[PDB]
Amino acid sequence: SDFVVIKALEDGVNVIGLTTRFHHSEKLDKGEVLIAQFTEHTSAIKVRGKAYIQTRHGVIESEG
Amino acid sequence: SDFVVIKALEDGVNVIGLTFHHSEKLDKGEVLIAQFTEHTSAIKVRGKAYIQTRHGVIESEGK
Amino acid sequence: SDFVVIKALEDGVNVIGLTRTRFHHSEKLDKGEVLIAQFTEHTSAIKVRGKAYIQTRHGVIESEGK
Amino acid sequence: SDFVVIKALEDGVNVIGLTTRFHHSEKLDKGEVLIAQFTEHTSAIKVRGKAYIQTRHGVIESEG
Amino acid sequence: SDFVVIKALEDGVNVIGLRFHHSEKLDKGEVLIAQFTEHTSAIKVRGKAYIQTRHGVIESEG
Amino acid sequence: SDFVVIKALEDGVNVIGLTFHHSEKLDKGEVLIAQFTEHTSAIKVRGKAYIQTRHGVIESE
Amino acid sequence: NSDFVVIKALEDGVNVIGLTRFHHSEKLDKGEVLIAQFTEHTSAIKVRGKAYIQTRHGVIESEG
Amino acid sequence: NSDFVVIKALEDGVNVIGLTRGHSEKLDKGEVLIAQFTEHTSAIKVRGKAYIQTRHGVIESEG
Amino acid sequence: SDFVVIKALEDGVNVIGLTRFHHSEKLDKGEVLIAQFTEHTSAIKVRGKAYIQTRHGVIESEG
Amino acid sequence: SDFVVIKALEDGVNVIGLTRFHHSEKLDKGEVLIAQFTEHTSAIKVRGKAYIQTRHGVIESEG
Amino acid sequence: SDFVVIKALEDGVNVIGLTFHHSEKLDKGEVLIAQFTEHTSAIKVRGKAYIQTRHGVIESEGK
């Protein structure tokens, strides 16, 4: 039941949900925030683009 | 069973629930306490807002 | 099983419960009244319109709404 | 399984349980203490009157 | 599965289980450790008592 | 699944399990570790005793 | 749903009594250590004798 | 369901006894036993000179 | 229900999910993967230069 | 679901799993075993010179 | 549902899953995040590696 907070630091950030071809994409624009939870459908989440990301394990910056 | 607190810092903030499911408009100063359902995998916030989660605070910045 | 504490700072604060789907169970609160609202299955989101002090597991926050 | 502690600071404090009409009211007199637990029947609890309230989220005072 | 500790500071303190009704008299210095059942949604304390809960201590006055 | 520790400070301390459904006498210096069952909603302590719970210590007089 | 007590006997003939009738007695000699867990069978545990007792709630000494 | 004790034998012939509802195991000086509580096993008695760690801190058994 | 955060410090970092070796996933410099353990996936191997966060602290994989 | 970390400080350290029954497992100097408790396995005995980490802190088994 | 983080400090580190069954080779600098399955009671690490567990860090000094 865990989640990640992703804040987009540029336009056209891509938050990709995975299972095994990559199955749910979600575009985010500069300053928008996504709170993404892990479903059963969704094993992994990839972030392409400049974003600030918070997880139970601390913060991290994607420099895609 | 976790939730997010969202306080709108301008009018017309948009709190979008993702499965193309559920939009919810918020006006400046209004507070939404949104919980994750089974229906709702992700929540997107478009607009200037202050957000609290289990993982600390964060600010969404509307263009 | 989590809850929010809402104290109304003016009369006519509105604590709106939202369904699993739009604006549903409304509940008016008057200046100084305190509501302890728990999330049900029926209730996915809670909106607060009006001047209120709110406590959640995630700390305090103040609603400055209409 | 969580609960609230309510101490009445005046007579005729009203502790109202909500399902959604005014299902269960409970009067409290100055100095009396109620330890109220959330049931399935009970989604929300309203406190009308001057009272000192303790929850998992800290203390708060209701002002009648 | 949570409980409250109640110590009576005078005689004839009343610990009421919750319209629903199990009453329990306590005398000065007696201690009750009351747990919440399914039967019991709320507990009222009438009388002067010292009360400990998960949420800290509190004193009932009369 | 929670429990209380009770140490008797005098003879003839009475540890009563409720819904007087089970009484249990304790003598000066004896220690009882009482757990809550489904059978047992409340526990009353009559007598001089030192009591430890999850919520800290307390003395019955 | 699964807690235990540590009991160290400070004299010979310490008695660790399991309750429900007075179900199960267990003698302890000076310096022996018993780690007793609560079963469904066992609601309460009585210690008679001089012993050092550790519980989740801290230490306590039984006196004779 | 699932807690354990660490027992280090400080002499030879330490006895770690498992007790049933209402199993002996010998330990020689310097051997370590990590014993978990089963359903079969309500209580554990230690006879002999040993160093014992539990969730509740350390304790020494004095044969 | 636990997860690892992997940030790629060079191009062509390989995040391999293990059953054999069943699921590979390439990551390019600066991309972030939040990988959760499934039932299908017992182990995860990281090949390449990466910064990794787990419940157990941080660690760097050295390509 | 708990586990012990055992690092062997000499050759031929013996990590014995108990229920009755005994799965033995030899460890050579500097090898590390992360042993989890199964239902099959009530107790674990360590014979030999080893460094042991458990939820309850560290402890050294003395050969 | 617990896991271990293993970083290989030399080539040819061996991460062995037990019930000598599932072996998994690791090369210098590669990282494995291994979870305990039902199939897998114990994990042995042979070779020079840095290991993180819920119980802190430890270094294997191996084959």
Side-chain angles (χ1 to χ4, degrees), chain E residues 1-24 26-27 29-62:
Chain E
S1 270
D2 218 340
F3 70 84
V4 308
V5 175
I6 302 165
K7 188 194 191 193
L9 295 170
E10 66 186 5
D11 289 328
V13 174
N14 219 8
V15 182
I16 313 164
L18 271 30
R19 45 218 73 83
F20 336 151
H21 196 89
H22 180 55
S23 156
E24 196 73 39
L26 272 170
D27 278 343
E30 275 163 0
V31 170
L32 192 68
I33 333 286
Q35 193 188 30
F36 280 102
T37 82
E38 64 161 45
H39 286 74
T40 286
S41 58
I43 292 161
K44 193 163 164 194
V45 183
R46 187 135 44 201
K48 308 228 188 271
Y50 187 68
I51 303 164
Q52 312 182 307
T53 59
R54 173 152 49 102
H55 300 329
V57 326
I58 193 154
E59 185 179 305
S60 65
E61 257 137 39

Short mmCIF file of all heavy atoms in Angstrom, two decimals, chain E, unseen atoms left out:
data_model
loop_
_atom_site.label_atom_id
_atom_site.label_comp_id
_atom_site.label_asym_id
_atom_site.label_seq_id
_atom_site.Cartn_x
_atom_site.Cartn_y
_atom_site.Cartn_z
N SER E 1 -8.57 -3.13 20.25
CA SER E 1 -8.03 -3.83 21.47
C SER E 1 -7.44 -2.89 22.53
O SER E 1 -6.56 -3.30 23.32
CB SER E 1 -6.98 -4.87 21.06
OG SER E 1 -7.58 -6.14 20.82
N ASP E 2 -7.91 -1.64 22.57
CA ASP E 2 -7.31 -0.65 23.48
C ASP E 2 -8.05 -0.55 24.81
O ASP E 2 -9.23 -0.92 24.90
CB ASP E 2 -7.19 0.72 22.80
CG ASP E 2 -5.90 1.45 23.20
OD1 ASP E 2 -5.28 1.10 24.24
OD2 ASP E 2 -5.50 2.37 22.45
N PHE E 3 -7.35 -0.05 25.82
CA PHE E 3 -7.88 0.04 27.18
C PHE E 3 -7.61 1.37 27.89
O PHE E 3 -6.73 2.12 27.51
CB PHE E 3 -7.35 -1.11 28.03
CG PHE E 3 -5.90 -0.99 28.33
CD1 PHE E 3 -5.46 -0.21 29.39
CD2 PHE E 3 -4.96 -1.65 27.55
CE1 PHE E 3 -4.11 -0.09 29.67
CE2 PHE E 3 -3.60 -1.53 27.81
CZ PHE E 3 -3.17 -0.74 28.87
N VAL E 4 -8.39 1.62 28.93
CA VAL E 4 -8.20 2.78 29.80
C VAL E 4 -8.02 2.37 31.25
O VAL E 4 -8.67 1.43 31.74
CB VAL E 4 -9.38 3.77 29.71
CG1 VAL E 4 -9.65 4.12 28.28
CG2 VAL E 4 -10.65 3.20 30.36
N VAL E 5 -7.14 3.09 31.92
CA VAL E 5 -6.85 2.88 33.33
C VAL E 5 -7.58 3.96 34.09
O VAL E 5 -7.44 5.15 33.77
CB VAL E 5 -5.34 2.98 33.60
CG1 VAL E 5 -5.07 2.88 35.08
CG2 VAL E 5 -4.60 1.90 32.84
N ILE E 6 -8.38 3.56 35.07
CA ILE E 6 -9.16 4.51 35.85
C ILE E 6 -8.95 4.26 37.32
O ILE E 6 -9.28 3.19 37.83
CB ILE E 6 -10.67 4.39 35.58
CG1 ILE E 6 -10.98 4.59 34.10
CG2 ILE E 6 -11.41 5.43 36.41
CD1 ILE E 6 -12.36 4.15 33.71
N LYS E 7 -8.42 5.26 38.00
CA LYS E 7 -8.27 5.20 39.45
C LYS E 7 -9.26 6.16 40.09
O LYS E 7 -9.32 7.35 39.73
CB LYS E 7 -6.85 5.56 39.86
CG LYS E 7 -6.59 5.32 41.32
CD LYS E 7 -5.32 6.00 41.78
CE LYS E 7 -4.93 5.55 43.17
NZ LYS E 7 -3.88 6.44 43.73
N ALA E 8 -10.03 5.64 41.05
CA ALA E 8 -11.08 6.42 41.70
C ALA E 8 -10.44 7.27 42.78
O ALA E 8 -9.70 6.75 43.61
CB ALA E 8 -12.12 5.51 42.29
N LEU E 9 -10.72 8.57 42.75
CA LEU E 9 -10.20 9.51 43.76
C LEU E 9 -11.18 9.81 44.92
O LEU E 9 -10.82 10.47 45.89
CB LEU E 9 -9.71 10.80 43.10
CG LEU E 9 -8.51 10.60 42.18
CD1 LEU E 9 -8.26 11.86 41.38
CD2 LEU E 9 -7.29 10.20 43.00
N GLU E 10 -12.41 9.33 44.79
CA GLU E 10 -13.41 9.42 45.85
C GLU E 10 -14.19 8.11 45.82
O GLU E 10 -13.96 7.28 44.94
CB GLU E 10 -14.32 10.64 45.63
CG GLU E 10 -15.21 10.57 44.39
CD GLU E 10 -15.98 11.87 44.13
OE1 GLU E 10 -15.75 12.86 44.86
OE2 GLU E 10 -16.82 11.91 43.20
N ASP E 11 -15.11 7.91 46.77
CA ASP E 11 -15.99 6.75 46.73
C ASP E 11 -17.11 7.00 45.74
O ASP E 11 -17.41 8.15 45.42
CB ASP E 11 -16.57 6.47 48.11
CG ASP E 11 -15.55 5.94 49.09
OD1 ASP E 11 -14.62 5.23 48.67
OD2 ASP E 11 -15.66 6.21 50.30
N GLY E 12 -17.70 5.92 45.25
CA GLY E 12 -18.86 5.99 44.37
C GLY E 12 -18.63 6.62 43.01
O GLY E 12 -19.49 7.35 42.51
N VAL E 13 -17.46 6.36 42.42
CA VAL E 13 -17.18 6.76 41.06
C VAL E 13 -17.91 5.79 40.16
O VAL E 13 -17.98 4.60 40.46
CB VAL E 13 -15.66 6.76 40.77
CG1 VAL E 13 -15.38 7.04 39.30
CG2 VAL E 13 -14.97 7.79 41.62
N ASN E 14 -18.45 6.28 39.06
CA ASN E 14 -19.25 5.46 38.19
C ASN E 14 -18.65 5.32 36.81
O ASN E 14 -18.46 6.32 36.11
CB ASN E 14 -20.64 6.07 38.10
CG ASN E 14 -21.73 5.03 38.08
OD1 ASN E 14 -21.46 3.84 38.29
ND2 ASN E 14 -22.97 5.47 37.85
N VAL E 15 -18.32 4.09 36.42
CA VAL E 15 -17.73 3.83 35.10
C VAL E 15 -18.78 3.19 34.22
O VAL E 15 -19.04 2.00 34.33
CB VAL E 15 -16.48 2.94 35.18
CG1 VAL E 15 -15.88 2.73 33.82
CG2 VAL E 15 -15.46 3.57 36.07
N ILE E 16 -19.37 3.98 33.33
CA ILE E 16 -20.52 3.54 32.56
C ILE E 16 -20.15 3.12 31.14
O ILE E 16 -19.56 3.90 30.38
CB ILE E 16 -21.57 4.64 32.51
CG1 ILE E 16 -21.79 5.21 33.90
CG2 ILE E 16 -22.87 4.10 31.94
CD1 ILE E 16 -22.52 6.53 33.91
N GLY E 17 -20.51 1.89 30.78
CA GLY E 17 -20.29 1.35 29.45
C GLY E 17 -21.51 1.57 28.60
O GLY E 17 -22.62 1.31 29.04
N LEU E 18 -21.31 2.05 27.38
CA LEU E 18 -22.40 2.43 26.47
C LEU E 18 -22.42 1.57 25.21
O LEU E 18 -21.38 1.15 24.71
CB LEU E 18 -22.26 3.91 26.10
CG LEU E 18 -22.89 5.03 26.94
CD1 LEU E 18 -23.01 4.71 28.41
CD2 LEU E 18 -22.12 6.34 26.74
N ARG E 19 -30.98 3.32 25.55
CA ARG E 19 -29.58 3.44 25.18
C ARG E 19 -28.67 2.60 26.09
O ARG E 19 -28.93 2.46 27.29
CB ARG E 19 -29.15 4.91 25.12
CG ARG E 19 -29.61 5.77 26.30
CD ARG E 19 -30.02 7.18 25.86
NE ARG E 19 -31.31 7.20 25.15
CZ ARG E 19 -32.51 7.22 25.74
NH1 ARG E 19 -32.62 7.21 27.06
NH2 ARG E 19 -33.61 7.25 24.99
N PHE E 20 -27.60 2.09 25.49
CA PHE E 20 -26.74 1.03 26.05
C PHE E 20 -26.24 1.34 27.48
O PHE E 20 -25.96 2.50 27.79
CB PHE E 20 -25.58 0.71 25.07
CG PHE E 20 -25.86 1.08 23.59
CD1 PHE E 20 -24.81 1.42 22.74
CD2 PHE E 20 -27.16 1.05 23.06
CE1 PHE E 20 -25.05 1.76 21.39
CE2 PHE E 20 -27.41 1.39 21.72
CZ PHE E 20 -26.35 1.74 20.89
N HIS E 21 -26.13 0.31 28.35
CA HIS E 21 -25.89 0.52 29.81
C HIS E 21 -25.34 -0.66 30.68
O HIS E 21 -26.12 -1.48 31.18
CB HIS E 21 -27.19 1.10 30.44
CG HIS E 21 -27.00 1.73 31.79
ND1 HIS E 21 -26.67 3.07 31.96
CD2 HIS E 21 -27.13 1.21 33.04
CE1 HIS E 21 -26.59 3.34 33.25
NE2 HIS E 21 -26.86 2.23 33.93
N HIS E 22 -24.01 -0.75 30.84
CA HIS E 22 -23.31 -1.46 31.94
C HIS E 22 -22.66 -0.42 32.85
O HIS E 22 -21.75 0.30 32.42
CB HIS E 22 -22.22 -2.41 31.38
CG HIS E 22 -21.47 -3.19 32.42
ND1 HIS E 22 -22.09 -4.00 33.35
CD2 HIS E 22 -20.13 -3.33 32.64
CE1 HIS E 22 -21.18 -4.58 34.12
NE2 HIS E 22 -19.98 -4.19 33.71
N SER E 23 -23.15 -0.31 34.08
CA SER E 23 -22.54 0.56 35.09
C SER E 23 -21.61 -0.23 36.02
O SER E 23 -21.79 -1.44 36.21
CB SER E 23 -23.62 1.29 35.89
OG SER E 23 -23.13 1.67 37.16
N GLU E 24 -20.62 0.44 36.59
CA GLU E 24 -19.63 -0.21 37.45
C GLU E 24 -19.14 0.78 38.49
O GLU E 24 -18.45 1.75 38.15
CB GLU E 24 -18.46 -0.74 36.61
CG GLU E 24 -17.59 -1.76 37.32
CD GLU E 24 -18.27 -3.11 37.47
OE1 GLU E 24 -18.97 -3.55 36.53
OE2 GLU E 24 -18.10 -3.74 38.53
N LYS E 25 -19.50 0.55 39.75
CA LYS E 25 -19.09 1.44 40.83
C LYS E 25 -17.65 1.17 41.27
O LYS E 25 -17.22 0.02 41.33
CB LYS E 25 -20.04 1.34 42.01
N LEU E 26 -16.91 2.25 41.54
CA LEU E 26 -15.52 2.20 42.03
C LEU E 26 -15.38 3.01 43.31
O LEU E 26 -15.92 4.11 43.41
CB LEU E 26 -14.55 2.77 40.99
CG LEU E 26 -13.96 1.84 39.93
CD1 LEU E 26 -13.23 2.67 38.88
CD2 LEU E 26 -13.03 0.81 40.54
N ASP E 27 -14.65 2.47 44.29
CA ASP E 27 -14.45 3.17 45.56
C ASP E 27 -13.05 3.76 45.68
O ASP E 27 -12.13 3.26 45.05
CB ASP E 27 -14.75 2.25 46.74
CG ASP E 27 -16.24 2.15 47.06
OD1 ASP E 27 -17.04 3.01 46.59
OD2 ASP E 27 -16.60 1.20 47.78
N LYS E 28 -12.91 4.83 46.48
CA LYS E 28 -11.68 5.62 46.59
C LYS E 28 -10.44 4.74 46.65
O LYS E 28 -10.28 3.96 47.58
N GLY E 29 -9.59 4.87 45.63
CA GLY E 29 -8.31 4.14 45.54
C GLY E 29 -8.33 2.86 44.71
O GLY E 29 -7.29 2.26 44.49
N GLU E 30 -9.51 2.44 44.27
CA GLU E 30 -9.63 1.24 43.44
C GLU E 30 -9.27 1.57 42.03
O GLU E 30 -9.41 2.71 41.59
CB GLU E 30 -11.05 0.69 43.48
CG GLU E 30 -11.31 -0.23 44.65
CD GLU E 30 -12.79 -0.45 44.92
OE1 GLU E 30 -13.64 0.11 44.19
OE2 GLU E 30 -13.09 -1.18 45.88
N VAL E 31 -8.77 0.58 41.31
CA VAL E 31 -8.32 0.78 39.94
C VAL E 31 -9.04 -0.17 39.01
O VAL E 31 -9.13 -1.37 39.27
CB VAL E 31 -6.79 0.62 39.82
CG1 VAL E 31 -6.37 0.58 38.37
CG2 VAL E 31 -6.08 1.76 40.54
N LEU E 32 -9.56 0.39 37.93
CA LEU E 32 -10.19 -0.38 36.89
C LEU E 32 -9.37 -0.27 35.62
O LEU E 32 -8.97 0.83 35.23
CB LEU E 32 -11.61 0.11 36.63
CG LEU E 32 -12.48 -0.79 35.76
CD1 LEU E 32 -12.80 -2.09 36.47
CD2 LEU E 32 -13.75 -0.07 35.41
N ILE E 33 -9.10 -1.40 34.99
CA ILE E 33 -8.50 -1.42 33.68
C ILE E 33 -9.58 -1.88 32.73
O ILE E 33 -9.90 -3.06 32.66
CB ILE E 33 -7.31 -2.39 33.58
CG1 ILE E 33 -6.62 -2.59 34.94
CG2 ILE E 33 -6.35 -1.92 32.49
CD1 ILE E 33 -5.79 -1.46 35.41
N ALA E 34 -10.16 -0.93 32.01
CA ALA E 34 -11.29 -1.24 31.15
C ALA E 34 -10.86 -1.32 29.70
O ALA E 34 -10.19 -0.42 29.21
CB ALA E 34 -12.37 -0.19 31.32
N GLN E 35 -11.26 -2.39 29.03
CA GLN E 35 -10.98 -2.56 27.62
C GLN E 35 -12.26 -2.33 26.84
O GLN E 35 -13.35 -2.55 27.35
CB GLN E 35 -10.45 -3.97 27.35
CG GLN E 35 -9.82 -4.17 25.97
CD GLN E 35 -9.48 -5.62 25.66
OE1 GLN E 35 -10.13 -6.55 26.14
NE2 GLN E 35 -8.45 -5.82 24.84
N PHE E 36 -12.11 -1.85 25.60
CA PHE E 36 -13.26 -1.68 24.71
C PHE E 36 -13.65 -3.00 24.07
O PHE E 36 -12.82 -3.66 23.46
CB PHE E 36 -12.93 -0.68 23.61
CG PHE E 36 -13.04 0.73 24.05
CD1 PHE E 36 -11.90 1.47 24.35
CD2 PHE E 36 -14.30 1.32 24.17
CE1 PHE E 36 -12.00 2.80 24.76
CE2 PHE E 36 -14.43 2.65 24.58
CZ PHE E 36 -13.27 3.39 24.88
N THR E 37 -14.91 -3.38 24.22
CA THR E 37 -15.39 -4.57 23.54
C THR E 37 -16.12 -4.13 22.27
O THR E 37 -16.13 -2.93 21.95
CB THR E 37 -16.32 -5.42 24.45
OG1 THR E 37 -17.66 -4.90 24.42
CG2 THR E 37 -15.81 -5.45 25.89
N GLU E 38 -16.69 -5.09 21.53
CA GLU E 38 -17.59 -4.76 20.42
C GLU E 38 -18.90 -4.23 20.98
O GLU E 38 -19.44 -3.25 20.47
CB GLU E 38 -17.81 -5.97 19.49
CG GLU E 38 -18.51 -7.19 20.11
CD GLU E 38 -19.11 -8.13 19.07
OE1 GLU E 38 -18.44 -8.44 18.06
OE2 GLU E 38 -20.27 -8.57 19.24
N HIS E 39 -19.38 -4.87 22.06
CA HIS E 39 -20.56 -4.45 22.83
C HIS E 39 -20.48 -2.99 23.29
O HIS E 39 -21.51 -2.31 23.42
CB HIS E 39 -20.70 -5.32 24.09
CG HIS E 39 -21.21 -6.71 23.83
ND1 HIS E 39 -20.42 -7.69 23.27
CD2 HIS E 39 -22.41 -7.28 24.09
CE1 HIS E 39 -21.12 -8.81 23.18
NE2 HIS E 39 -22.33 -8.59 23.67
N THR E 40 -19.26 -2.52 23.55
CA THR E 40 -19.02 -1.24 24.21
C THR E 40 -18.34 -0.21 23.29
O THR E 40 -17.13 -0.28 23.03
CB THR E 40 -18.24 -1.44 25.54
OG1 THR E 40 -19.12 -2.00 26.53
CG2 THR E 40 -17.68 -0.14 26.07
N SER E 41 -19.13 0.75 22.81
CA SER E 41 -18.65 1.82 21.95
C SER E 41 -18.00 2.96 22.74
O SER E 41 -16.94 3.46 22.36
CB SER E 41 -19.78 2.37 21.09
OG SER E 41 -20.85 2.83 21.88
N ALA E 42 -18.63 3.37 23.84
CA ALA E 42 -18.15 4.50 24.64
C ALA E 42 -18.13 4.20 26.13
O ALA E 42 -18.87 3.35 26.60
CB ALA E 42 -18.99 5.73 24.37
N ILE E 43 -17.28 4.90 26.87
CA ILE E 43 -17.19 4.76 28.32
C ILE E 43 -17.23 6.13 28.97
O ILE E 43 -16.42 7.00 28.65
CB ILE E 43 -15.89 4.05 28.76
CG1 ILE E 43 -15.90 2.59 28.33
CG2 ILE E 43 -15.74 4.11 30.25
CD1 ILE E 43 -14.51 1.97 28.30
N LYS E 44 -18.16 6.31 29.90
CA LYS E 44 -18.35 7.58 30.59
C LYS E 44 -17.86 7.40 32.01
O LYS E 44 -18.10 6.37 32.62
CB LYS E 44 -19.83 7.93 30.58
CG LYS E 44 -20.23 9.35 30.98
CD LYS E 44 -21.65 9.60 30.50
CE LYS E 44 -22.30 10.79 31.15
NZ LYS E 44 -23.76 10.74 30.88
N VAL E 45 -17.15 8.41 32.52
CA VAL E 45 -16.71 8.39 33.92
C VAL E 45 -17.32 9.56 34.69
O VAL E 45 -17.04 10.73 34.38
CB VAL E 45 -15.17 8.44 34.06
CG1 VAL E 45 -14.76 8.35 35.51
CG2 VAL E 45 -14.52 7.32 33.29
N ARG E 46 -18.14 9.23 35.68
CA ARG E 46 -18.77 10.22 36.54
C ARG E 46 -18.17 10.08 37.93
O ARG E 46 -18.22 9.00 38.53
CB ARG E 46 -20.28 10.00 36.56
CG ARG E 46 -21.07 11.08 37.29
CD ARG E 46 -22.33 11.54 36.53
NE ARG E 46 -23.12 10.45 35.94
CZ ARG E 46 -23.99 10.60 34.93
NH1 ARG E 46 -24.19 11.79 34.37
NH2 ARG E 46 -24.65 9.55 34.48
N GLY E 47 -17.59 11.16 38.44
CA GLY E 47 -16.93 11.14 39.74
C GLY E 47 -15.51 11.65 39.63
O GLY E 47 -15.04 11.90 38.52
N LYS E 48 -14.83 11.82 40.76
CA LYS E 48 -13.45 12.29 40.68
C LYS E 48 -12.50 11.12 40.52
O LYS E 48 -12.40 10.25 41.38
CB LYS E 48 -13.09 13.25 41.83
CG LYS E 48 -14.09 14.39 41.94
CD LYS E 48 -13.45 15.75 42.06
CE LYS E 48 -14.52 16.81 42.38
NZ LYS E 48 -15.19 17.45 41.19
N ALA E 49 -11.86 11.08 39.35
CA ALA E 49 -10.96 9.98 38.99
C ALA E 49 -9.73 10.43 38.21
O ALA E 49 -9.74 11.48 37.57
CB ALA E 49 -11.70 8.91 38.22
N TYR E 50 -8.69 9.61 38.29
CA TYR E 50 -7.49 9.78 37.48
C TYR E 50 -7.49 8.75 36.34
O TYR E 50 -7.61 7.54 36.58
CB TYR E 50 -6.25 9.63 38.36
CG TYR E 50 -4.91 9.93 37.69
CD1 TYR E 50 -4.55 11.24 37.29
CD2 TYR E 50 -3.98 8.92 37.50
CE1 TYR E 50 -3.28 11.51 36.70
CE2 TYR E 50 -2.72 9.19 36.91
CZ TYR E 50 -2.39 10.48 36.51
OH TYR E 50 -1.15 10.71 35.96
N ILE E 51 -7.38 9.23 35.11
CA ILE E 51 -7.55 8.38 33.95
C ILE E 51 -6.30 8.39 33.03
O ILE E 51 -5.80 9.45 32.64
CB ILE E 51 -8.78 8.81 33.15
CG1 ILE E 51 -10.04 8.80 34.02
CG2 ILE E 51 -8.97 7.90 31.93
CD1 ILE E 51 -11.22 9.56 33.43
N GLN E 52 -5.81 7.20 32.69
CA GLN E 52 -4.72 7.09 31.72
C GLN E 52 -5.21 6.42 30.44
O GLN E 52 -5.82 5.34 30.50
CB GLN E 52 -3.57 6.23 32.25
CG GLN E 52 -3.12 6.58 33.64
CD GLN E 52 -1.93 5.75 34.14
OE1 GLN E 52 -1.93 4.49 34.12
NE2 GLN E 52 -0.92 6.46 34.64
N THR E 53 -4.93 7.04 29.30
CA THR E 53 -5.24 6.43 28.03
C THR E 53 -4.01 6.51 27.17
O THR E 53 -3.07 7.21 27.50
CB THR E 53 -6.39 7.15 27.29
OG1 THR E 53 -6.04 8.53 27.06
CG2 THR E 53 -7.68 7.03 28.10
N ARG E 54 -4.04 5.82 26.04
CA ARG E 54 -3.00 5.98 25.03
C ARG E 54 -2.74 7.48 24.80
O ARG E 54 -1.63 7.89 24.48
CB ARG E 54 -3.38 5.24 23.71
CG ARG E 54 -2.42 5.48 22.51
CD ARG E 54 -2.36 4.29 21.49
NE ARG E 54 -3.70 3.83 21.08
CZ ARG E 54 -4.32 4.11 19.93
NH1 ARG E 54 -3.73 4.87 18.98
NH2 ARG E 54 -5.56 3.61 19.73
N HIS E 55 -3.74 8.33 25.02
CA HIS E 55 -3.58 9.73 24.63
C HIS E 55 -3.03 10.60 25.72
O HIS E 55 -2.99 11.84 25.55
CB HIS E 55 -4.87 10.33 24.04
CG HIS E 55 -5.35 9.61 22.82
ND1 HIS E 55 -4.49 8.99 21.93
CD2 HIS E 55 -6.60 9.41 22.34
CE1 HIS E 55 -5.19 8.42 20.97
NE2 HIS E 55 -6.47 8.67 21.18
N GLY E 56 -2.59 9.96 26.82
CA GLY E 56 -2.08 10.67 28.01
C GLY E 56 -3.02 10.61 29.19
O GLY E 56 -3.96 9.82 29.17
N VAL E 57 -2.77 11.44 30.21
CA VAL E 57 -3.62 11.41 31.41
C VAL E 57 -4.67 12.52 31.40
O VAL E 57 -4.56 13.53 30.66
CB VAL E 57 -2.84 11.44 32.72
CG1 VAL E 57 -1.57 10.70 32.56
CG2 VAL E 57 -2.51 12.86 33.14
N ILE E 58 -5.70 12.32 32.20
CA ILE E 58 -6.76 13.27 32.34
C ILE E 58 -7.51 12.94 33.62
O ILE E 58 -7.59 11.77 34.05
CB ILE E 58 -7.70 13.28 31.13
CG1 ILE E 58 -8.59 14.51 31.18
CG2 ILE E 58 -8.55 12.00 31.08
CD1 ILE E 58 -9.08 14.95 29.84
N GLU E 59 -8.05 14.00 34.22
CA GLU E 59 -8.70 13.93 35.53
C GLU E 59 -10.19 14.20 35.34
O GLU E 59 -10.57 15.19 34.70
CB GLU E 59 -8.04 14.98 36.45
CG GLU E 59 -8.51 15.00 37.91
CD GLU E 59 -7.78 16.06 38.74
OE1 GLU E 59 -6.51 16.03 38.77
OE2 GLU E 59 -8.46 16.91 39.37
N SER E 60 -11.05 13.33 35.86
CA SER E 60 -12.48 13.61 35.82
C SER E 60 -12.86 14.27 37.13
O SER E 60 -12.47 13.82 38.21
CB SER E 60 -13.30 12.34 35.60
OG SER E 60 -13.17 11.45 36.69
N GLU E 61 -13.62 15.36 37.04
CA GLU E 61 -13.96 16.15 38.20
C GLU E 61 -15.45 16.09 38.54
O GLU E 61 -16.23 16.91 38.07
CB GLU E 61 -13.50 17.61 38.01
CG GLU E 61 -12.25 17.95 38.78
CD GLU E 61 -11.26 18.75 37.97
OE1 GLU E 61 -11.65 19.66 37.19
OE2 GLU E 61 -10.05 18.48 38.13
N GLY E 62 -15.84 15.12 39.39
CA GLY E 62 -17.20 15.05 39.93
C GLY E 62 -18.16 14.37 38.97
O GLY E 62 -17.74 13.86 37.92
#
